[PDB]
Subunit: 176 residues, 4 copies
């Protein structure tokens, strides 16, 4: 089991290196963007990487399906004018997504003045071959990847995180 | 409150990344310049960034007003000649500032031989939108930013720091 | 003795800097590859360095003999198809090596879909001159270097490590 | 006093950044060279920096006098042949120095096969202006800088260190 806990954590760590531009171990809770170009770059790197996955990954990952949802969230209405010290805000959070299908989004225009966050969602399928070592049959994993560029604090600093969730089932038909 | 303590600290952290050339988390008490070009570069980066703020920041900051004071301080009289082992000094500290107005200083010439320090001062206005999450009304923050290139130790090493101070009041007229 | 423990550890540390592309102290247990080009690069750097050893090393190392074994290991049979949720695997591990003789492998093609690991093996001979300080006679060391690109976890992350083993004997004929 | 302990340590820290190529805080006990080009580069950087000191330093340092001694040390006789497992060594350590006078060594050819170490020695004069803050009269410091590329362990790894020693006296004639 814990060798499978390590399988989820190992795969997630790999995802951070693969999809998080400029990521390096130990940076998890300080990793963040501070400029618009930094943020656009991080977003485009994560999607491009997703699209190049078959050619660059050291793991054999399979796409699931639309494949990737690039979503930005912002206030339905956001007039923020710190200069004349006022604002007119409608707190309802609106979601705008761009679907990306692997068999191929850069026109993306973020509404920085009232941005709540940006998320990139997608799933990846992989076989836990390691199980073969213990003479067991490999599990069929489905990873749910969630990359978040959180701006909920509206503090000029946008922390970036990558989390996952694994769905373990039994592969259709194995052969060992 | 502490979520507002975090609002001041989060904004300050963002300022360190935005205005401190080559800055990275964890470097706070060792961050420093050691060469003249390093120092000129740090100074010009902080001002250029200040001027580009509207186009590069992930936060919606407003200028306040002159906007930025680039000041160097040096001894009224400073003949330092370690070679012939003497010096003639008048300890009175003279301040020379260059005002920078956003709607636009590189001729700056530092008096290295008797430099006491260089400071960059400016204020930024921002709304604490986060307060909307707790169903409260957003505060109107005025950040006072102070970047110091301290040479008071005259030790060949010039530590660089960025500190801030927040003035919290109530925005003119809000709308939620 | 412990000064000889330090001789083995010092030499090994040097090997990590010499043969591990992008290596830096303190990275030992997180050091890894995540892309195919990263892995090919690490492998080619270690071999090229090995071949350039006489011209770049600060230590006087001697080749031993074939000199270097660049081996990749993979499952005898590996059809991994996470997309259609199946696999057909023959767990027997097959080893394919490429011998490299110093008096000179880039056509290498890794079988990523069923890669178990890659290893680079070679020996280096060196004299422990340090022993001269204590007025003793220098030992004759034979270092066995093993660079492993371990993919046994099939988790998208390939940790890279460099270990050694020393064979201490008495040099043929010394002169001090 | 301790503010003067800090004056010596602050100046030394500055020297590490100024003269040690690729140096960064916290690297003190792992800082080292591993290749011949790395070592030649470190050596030439330290001398070039020394020569450019007046134009690049943030401190007002004065040369003392020849100014810089670039010395390499090696065994009087060193035939090291790990391949045919023998050696013929005369442990007497020979010193070969190149004097560098500021009013201006790259032909340097290190005897890597029997190198004991390389050292760079020079003195710098500076006034402790800080003393003016406490209303005291500034001391006249003479820093003795010693950069060592130690190969005494003959282990393929050459640790590099920079140490100093301060001679405090009273400046000829001060004026405050």
């Amino acid at each position: 089991n814990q060798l499978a806990v390590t399988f989820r954590e190992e795969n997630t760590i790999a995802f951070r290196h693969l999809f998080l531009l400029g990521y390096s171990d130990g940076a998890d809770d300080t990793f963040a963007a501070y400029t618009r170009e930094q943020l656009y770059q991080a977003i485009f790197h994560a999607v491009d990487q997703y699209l190049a996955l078959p050619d660059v990954s050291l793991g054999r990952y399979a796409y699931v399906r639309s494949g990737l949802a690039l979503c930005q969230r912002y206030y339905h209405r956001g007039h923020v004018d710190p200069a004349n010290d006022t604002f007119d805000i409608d707190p309802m959070v609106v979601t705008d997504c761009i679907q990306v299908d692997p068999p191929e989004y850069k026109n993306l225009t973020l509404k920085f003045h009232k941005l709540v966050n940006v998320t990139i969602h997608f799933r990846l399928k992989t076989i836990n071959l390691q199980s073969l070592i213990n003479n067991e049959i490999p599990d069929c994993y489905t990873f749910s990847v969630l990359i978040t560029f959180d701006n909920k604090a509206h503090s000029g600093r946008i922390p970036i995180s990558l989390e996952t969730q694994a769905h373990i089932q039994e592969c259709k038909h194995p052969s060992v």
